[PDB]
């Protein structure tokens, strides 16, 4: 079991979101802070999701770097199934 | 401000963990609004794995998720939970700071002391004394 | 909604060509739903008692209509992003549209506030509000005073400690005097005691005595209940009772605390000049005071020092304008002090204590107006009193804006 | 619609929305009032009058939509003043007949009482020696208990939330001033000791399974001191709070809030035990019976649920509001609920059979409080539109009105001898009303000619610094307790 | 500006005197993404019926397919009188009564051991 394995060696490594931020939005919908390394995957799991967009849109940006526009998270978030709205006001 | 201070102490963290994470092989000098957009699908983020890993423990009669509450949250948000090990070992990994908090004295009151008056047998002792 | 508005957001998605009645149809549709949820928003508004209408509740009346309060984006797939919400966008019309992505990481924290406590108090004391501060507040009769025997025991009590026989008594009354609600209607005689006192207190000058007095009146001003300007006429005198005013008492010495009273009642002036302001009444007579004491031939030492810290506080301009033609006449009093012939009086401690000041507030103003350059010999154009140590000063205030 | 009453201006504005049928057809409450029937008591000296210019064919089809669409309830007497008339209008549906309010209602207390079950006075379920005890050191607190009248008026002391930027939805105190309960916004129940005792939880099952027989060992032996604060947050609502309950016994908190369960946290525990889940839309209030095994719901879903605490289904739906049911209150022979609603009506409700037994109509806005007398024969409603209304149970005629408050009155509690009624309101006042000269008066017309005793029923005002009296509580001494999250 | 200072004016008719400044821009914000979501199905449903142009039709059938998906609303009242009948002449069998913690059968109540991993 990797996983398990893995959320044991989560009572160093600091996360890019702390955990007093991490642990308010999970408060905010009842999960509350027994283990810290719990909230440390969660926090990791939140990074990944964001990186991975940010990392495809880099991608939609290189064939077009240097500025991420909404023109480049609409085709980046189009192949996850969401659909960026633009403000347009 | 410390009413609005409430929110923007723990949204504008959010804010600067999108800029340290669009900076971790990537950007610099960002659009505002898709700065704003980020970190609003970043609070929205931790907002449902608050109140879906809540939902799958209480279904299983418990009040406090265990590490399998969520291995089955992230599986129903389409994650690919396995991914993760190799996300937290980074060498690029950062981390921001928490908000300050507002009573920084926390005892800095020296008071009034003024005592005159007692009690009416209606009112018991423990409600605060009559004043001067 | 206008509809020129709903033509602009067709166009600018590939659906050209639209005719007006294609184009009205969009614009009461929607502004029936902004209308349906503004109405639902409210209901989360009444039964939150807040009377608000915050950002939150267009949240929840979103999804009390099944729509997503997902703001900005939304998802086909429904998953990811389910009813709950992101918080909406921070966004602005005024806004810049592009930021470094450096400033917003440098950037401090805004401080999380307090959390919720439970505190009690009494609205009610068997019928009449009481005035503590988390409540909004043919023979003629004997007449009575119009201060009840607990008010005229408070007073004299306040007093008697404010005289500074014990240091605790003293501070506390102090911050009885800066936070009682119900020290209004006592006030005309706490001002006709400090007056009284400075005045038969200066008759000898007790520096104590004075010294307490001068922290009533702070005490006094910051208090945020009581109305002042009615009594700041009597007050002005009192509390500048001593600023230039010799010393009947041994002067040499205690000359630093005295001197130390004297900047407190700078700094309660500045604050006067702050406030109770109206046109050419209070701030310009007291600069006209202490100009004509400034401009006196044979001026009282302890005087010419005690006017001088009462020009010198008054704040960025005032110096940028009243400080700058007298340097010469500082200089040639300085000169006499320092030839003698013989110490018949404290002038000399005066001499050093004035020129000290007089040379922090020129740099200061130097440092203000014109770049750090020649700041080793272009000081002798003015009879070269701070000179090089001037430069210092300044070179250490340009340190502490560094920091800042 | 320029031509109709000011008290109807929050009616119509819905009403020019409302243009499609399509419209119209998802909005439930006006399709519930095009199906029912404007209920219209009008006098028989009127109605004779109406009735020769609507019999004629001149008119013809006026005549076709009133009797179409229009009940009109008959009553032998005088025809009403305006200020009379004004005093009981203002719901859809509204003005509801007497052979409504002609059943025979048990409105007396349990232990003689004979509008009220002879016999059986269940004096709470199974009454245990633990609660035999409580009532024992209640009386020594009725020994201290002021009579208040309109000389001794009571003094108020104000429980104020400081900070509060979690919007504080929900107070409740227990019956003696020990506990004071806080749903918020945030999700969040908050439990704080007002007494200085603090809360403690009791000890896990591996320290009581120690724990020796006899040698006392019954309800000190067991609380935990390791676990000992002022303040124990309750964590599990996934939406904001709106209903809290004690339990008569100083346990079972009871809290709903606007994802549809209404949950029961332990006090012995400070743990969540059942989240009842029959609402799929927000629970705006609960409460306890007052001998603590039943408990109402009422949510938005226009019915009211009545539970017992042992069934994860209710037993008794009062589904008979056309709005939300703002309000759920208990009588205090727990025989009867009260639920006032947003239609403008306040219904009693029978436990048995689930039976409107009564309906109260005059309020102009959403009845926001509810509150019982003592002795069980009236009942004090408050709504947006400032009116305390007080109403009797055995007749049904509201025989008073209280109008000093300006905005909507969401806090009213009766004293514990019945002397005074408290009002709190967003008006940021605590107005005391006179409880006895108000019933002192107390048929065959179905009302009374109320004056306008408001002035003289006036005691106090007490206008609080920028708070609004969210609850009004009063101490076994007779000490007014109110709660307000300070804005 | 245009579209917001009618939204002002939308609150202000339905009573609502006081709302926050973030009120309106996310209204805005729905209704946008309302109108962008009748008027892609719009095209969709013109594509079916193979005509270029979108007309009134299209928007017909694209409103009232999203009406009948999106906004719903609470149970009628004559399916809440039914179902209340059913139940308030029920007799609503039989559990188990004294139970101390009187509560329902525990795989509905939310008490169960509550494990948690090792720390190690």
């Known amino acids: 079991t990797p996983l398990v394995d893995f959320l044991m060696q989560l009572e160093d490594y600091t996360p890019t979101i702390p955990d007093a931020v991490t642990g308010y939005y999970l408060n905010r919908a009842g999960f509350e802070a027994s283990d810290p390394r719990i909230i440390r995957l969660i926090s990791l799991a939140a990074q990944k999701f964001i990186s991975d967009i940010a990392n495809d849109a880099l991608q939609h940006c290189k064939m077009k770097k240097y500025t991420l526009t909404m023109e480049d998270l609409t085709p980046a978030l189009s192949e996850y199934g969401i659909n960026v709205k633009k403000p347009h006001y | 401000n410390p009413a609005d201070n409430y929110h923007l102490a723990r949204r504008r963290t959010l804010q600067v963990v999108v800029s340290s994470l669009l900076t971790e092989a990537g950007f610099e000098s960002a659009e505002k609004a898709s700065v704003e957009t980020l970190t609003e699908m970043l609070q929205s983020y931790i907002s449902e794995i608050g109140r879906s890993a809540k939902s799958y423990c209480e279904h299983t009669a418990r009040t406090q998720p265990t590490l399998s509450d969520i291995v089955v949250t992230l599986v129903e948000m389409g994650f690919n939970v396995d991914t993760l090990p190799a996300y937290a070992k980074r060498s690029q990994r950062m981390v921001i700071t928490a908000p300050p908090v507002t009573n920084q004295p926390v005892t800095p009151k020296a008071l009034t002391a003024g005592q005159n008056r007692p009690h009416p047998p209606h009112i018991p002792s423990h409600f605060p004394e009559f004043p001067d | ?404 | 619609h320029g031509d109709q009453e000011c008290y109807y201006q929050d009616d119509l504005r819905v009403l020019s929305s409302l243009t499609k049928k399509e419209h119209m057809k998802g909005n439930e409450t006006m399709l519930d009032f095009r199906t029912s029937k404007f209920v219209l008591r009008i006098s028989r000296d009127s109605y004779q009058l109406l009735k020769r210019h609507l019999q004629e064919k001149q008119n013809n089809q006026i005549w076709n939509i009133v009797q179409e669409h229009l009940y009109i309830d008959i009553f032998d007497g005088m025809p009403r003043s305006k200020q009379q008339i004004d005093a009981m209008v203002g719901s859809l549906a509204g003005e509801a007949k007497r052979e409504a309010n002609k059943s025979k209602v048990f409105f007396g207390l349990l232990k003689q009482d004979p509008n009220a079950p002879p016999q059986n006075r269940i004096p709470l379920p199974e009454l245990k020696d633990s609660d035999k005890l409580d009532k024992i050191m209640n009386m020594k607190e009725t020994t201290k208990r002021v009579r208040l009248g309109p000389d001794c008026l009571p003094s108020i002391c104000f429980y104020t939330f400081l900070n509060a930027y979690q919007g504080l939805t929900a107070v409740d105190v227990t019956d003696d001033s020990s506990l004071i309960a806080g749903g918020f916004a945030d999700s969040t129940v908050r439990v704080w000791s007002v007494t200085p005792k603090k809360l403690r939880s009791v000890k896990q099952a591996s320290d009581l399974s120690l724990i020796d027989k006899e040698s006392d060992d019954v309800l000190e032996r067991i609380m935990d001191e390791k676990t000992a604060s002022e303040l124990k947050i309750l964590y599990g609502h996934s939406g904001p709070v709106y209903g809290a309950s004690f339990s008569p016994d100083r346990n079972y908190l009871l809290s709903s809030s606007e994802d549809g369960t209404v949950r029961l946290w332990s006090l012995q525990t400070f743990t969540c035990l059942v989240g009842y889940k029959g609402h799929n839309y927000p629970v705006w209030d609960t409460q306890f019976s007052p001998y603590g095994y039943y408990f109402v719901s009422g949510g938005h879903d226009r019915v009211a649920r009545l539970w017992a605490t042992d069934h994860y289904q209710p037993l008794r739906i009062f589904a008979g509001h056309l709005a939300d049911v703002n309000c759920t209150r208990f009588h205090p022979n727990s025989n009867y609920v009260a639920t006032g609603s947003a239609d403008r009506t306040v219904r009693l409700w029978d436990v048995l059979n689930g039976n409107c037994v009564r309906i109260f109509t005059g309020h102009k806005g959403p009845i926001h409080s509810l509150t019982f007398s003592p002795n069980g024969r009236f009942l004090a409603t408050g709504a947006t539109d400032g009116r305390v209304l007080l109403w009797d149970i055995g007749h049904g005629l509201m025989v008073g009105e209280l109008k000093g408050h300006t905005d909507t009155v969401c806090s009213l509690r009766f004293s514990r001898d019945g002397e005074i009624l408290a009002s709190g309101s967003m008006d940021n006042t605590v107005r005391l009303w006179d409880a006895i000269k108000a019933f002192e008066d107390l048929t065959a017309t179905g009302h009374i000619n109320l004056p306008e005793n408001s002035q003289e029923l006036l005691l106090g005002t007490y206008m609080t610094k920028s708070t609004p009296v969210v609850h009004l509580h009063f101490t076994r001494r007779n000490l007014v307790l109110a709660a307000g999250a300070y804005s | 500006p245009k579209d917001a200072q009618m939204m002002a004016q939308i609150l202000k008719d339905m009573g609502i005197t006081e709302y926050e400044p973030r009120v309106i821009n996310q209204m805005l914000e729905f209704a946008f993404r309302y109108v962008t979501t009748i008027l892609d199905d719009a095209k969709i449903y013109s594509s079916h019926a193979k005509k270029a142009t979108v007309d009134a039709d299209d928007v017909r059938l694209a409103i009232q397919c999203r009406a009948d998906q999106s906004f719903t609303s609470p149970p009628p009242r004559d399916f809440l009188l039914d179902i209340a009948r059913q139940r308030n002449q029920t007799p609503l069998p039989l559990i188990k009564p004294y139970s101390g913690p009187r509560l329902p059968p525990d795989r509905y109540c939310l008490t169960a051991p509550n494990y948690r991993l090792k720390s190690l």
């Open chain 3, 1 to 404: 909604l206008p509809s020129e508005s709903m033509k602009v957001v067709a166009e600018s998605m590939g659906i050209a060509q639209i005719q007006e009645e294609t184009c009205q149809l969009l614009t009461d549709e929607v502004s029936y739903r902004i209308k349906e949820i503004a109405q639902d928003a409210l209901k989360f508004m009444h039964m939150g008692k807040r009377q608000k209408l915050t950002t939150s509740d267009i949240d929840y009346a979103l999804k009390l209509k099944n729509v997503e309060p997902l703001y900005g984006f939304h998802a086909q797939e429904f998953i990811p992003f389910r009813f709950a919400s992101g918080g909406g966008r921070e966004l602005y019309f005024y806004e810049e549209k592009e930021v470094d992505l450096s400033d917003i990481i440098n950037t401090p924290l805004p401080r999380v506030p307090l959390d919720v406590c439970l505190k009690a108090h009494w609205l009610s004391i068997e019928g009449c509000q009481p005035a503590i501060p988390e409540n909004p507040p043919r023979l003629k009769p004997r007449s009575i005073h119009e201060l009840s025997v607990e008010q005229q025991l408070y007073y004299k009590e306040i007093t008697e400690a404010c005289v500074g026989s014990c240091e605790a008594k003293r501070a506390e009354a102090l911050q009885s005097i800066a936070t009682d609600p119900g020290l209004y209607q006592m006030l005309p005689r706490f001002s006709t005691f400090i007056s009284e006192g400075v005045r038969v207190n200066v008759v000898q000058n007790n520096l104590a005595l004075l010294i307490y007095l001068m922290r009533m009146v702070k005490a006094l001003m910051d208090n945020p209940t009581l109305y002042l300007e009615k009594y700041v006429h009597e007050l002005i005198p009192a509390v500048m009772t001593c600023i230039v005013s010799r010393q009947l008492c041994l002067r040499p010495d205690v000359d630093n605390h005295w001197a130390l009273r004297d900047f407190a009642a700078r700094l309660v002036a500045q604050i006067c000049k702050h406030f109770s302001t109206t046109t050419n009444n209070i701030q310009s007579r007291i600069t006209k005071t202490f100009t004509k004491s400034w401009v006196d031939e044979k001026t009282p030492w302890t005087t010419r020092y005690g006017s001088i810290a009462g020009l010198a506080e008054l704040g960025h301009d005032v110096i940028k304008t009243l400080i700058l033609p007298r340097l010469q006449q500082e200089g040639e009093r300085i000169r006499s002090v320092l030839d003698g012939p013989v110490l018949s009086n404290i002038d000399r401690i005066g001499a050093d204590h004035v020129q000290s000041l007089l040379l922090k507030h020129c740099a200061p103003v130097l440092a203000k107006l014109r770049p750090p350059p020649d700041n080793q010999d272009a000081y002798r154009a003015e009879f070269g009193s701070l000179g090089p140590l001037l430069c210092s000063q300044v070179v250490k205030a340009r340190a502490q804006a560094a920091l800042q």
